[PDB]
């Protein structure tokens, strides 16, 4: 389905979770975009004003779409495929406790998955894939895209 038809993509962090230090939110999101720029021709840039392609939002409960969040647990985040307006945007449930580590829900790992959707990927049935729909903590020692994820993204880009 839909893909970005340009190589320079922008993102903006709409608001910041109080669960984390501001700089750690910025870094987690930046690093998550890097995972995907490493395996595609895409370039990602953070902007702080105006309309970005991919808006990163922390929100809880009903927050303006059909994908209302459900309090702590269950659904952690959701994202829209490429397109105008809400297309591309990535939403993170503030009722989770976001972190840089194994405690709570790791923001970086969740953002890698969400951004996969923001770039046009669907879910994988392979539990080893980052696009599998259940969160799995892995350290940034073992984390890597799986073959399934790589094939998926290169079938869309590059
Ligand atoms: C502790 N919670 C979870 O591991 C839930 C479990 C779950 C599975 C299926 C349906 C609902 C919840 N997984 C998610 O939150 C998904 C995001 C994860 C992979 C980072 C989320 C499901 S919607 C999603 O794929 N967004 O794009
Ligand atoms: Ca958008
Ligand atoms: Ca939730
Ligand atoms: Ca929170
Ligand atoms: Zn949403
Ligand atoms: Zn998903």
Curated annotation (Swiss-Prot):
Residues annotated to bind Ca(2+) 2: 53, 85, 87, 89
Coiled-coil annotated residue ranges, if any: none
Active site: 114
Top-level taxon: Eukaryota
Gene induction: By exposure to bacterial lipopolysaccharides (LPS). Inhibited by dexamethasone.
Record-listed Zn(2+) 2 binding positions: 113, 117, 123
Positions of Ca(2+) 3 binding: 70-71, 73, 75, 93, 96
Binding site for Zn(2+) 1: 63, 65, 78, 91
Residue sites binding Ca(2+) 1 per the record: 19, 94, 96
Localization: Secreted, Extracellular space, Extracellular matrix
Tissue: Found in alveolar macrophages but not in peripheral blood monocytes.
Domain notes: The conserved cysteine present in the cysteine-switch motif binds the catalytic zinc ion, thus inhibiting the enzyme. The dissociation of the cysteine from the zinc ion upon the activation-peptide release activates the enzyme.
Function description: May be involved in tissue injury and remodeling. Has significant elastolytic activity. Can accept large and small amino acids at the P1' site, but has a preference for leucine. Aromatic or hydrophobic residues are preferred at the P1 site, with small hydrophobic residues (preferably alanine) occupying P3.
Family: Belongs to the peptidase M10A family.
Protein name, as recorded: Macrophage metalloelastase
Gene designation: MMP12
Range of the intact protein held here: 106 to 263 of 470
């Amino acid at each position: 389905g839909p893909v970005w038809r340009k190589h320079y993509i922008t993102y903006r962090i709409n608001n910041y979770t109080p669960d984390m230090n501001r700089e750690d939110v910025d870094y987690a999101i930046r690093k998550a975009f890097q995972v995907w720029s490493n395996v595609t021709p895409l370039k990602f840039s953070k902007i702080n004003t105006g309309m970005a392609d991919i808006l990163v939002v922390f929100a809880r409960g009903a927050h303006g779409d059909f994908h209302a969040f459900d309090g702590k647990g269950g659904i952690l985040a959701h994202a829209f495929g490429p397109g105008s307006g809400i297309g591309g945007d990535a939403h993170f449930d503030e009722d989770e406790f976001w972190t840089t580590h194994s405690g709570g829900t790791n923001l970086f790992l969740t953002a890698v998955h969400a951004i996969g959707h923001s770039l046009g990927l669907g879910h994988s049935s392979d539990p080893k894939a980052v696009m599998f729909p259940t969160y799995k903590y892995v350290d940034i020692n073992t984390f890597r895209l799986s073959a399934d994820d790589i094939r998926g993204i290169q079938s869309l880009y590059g």
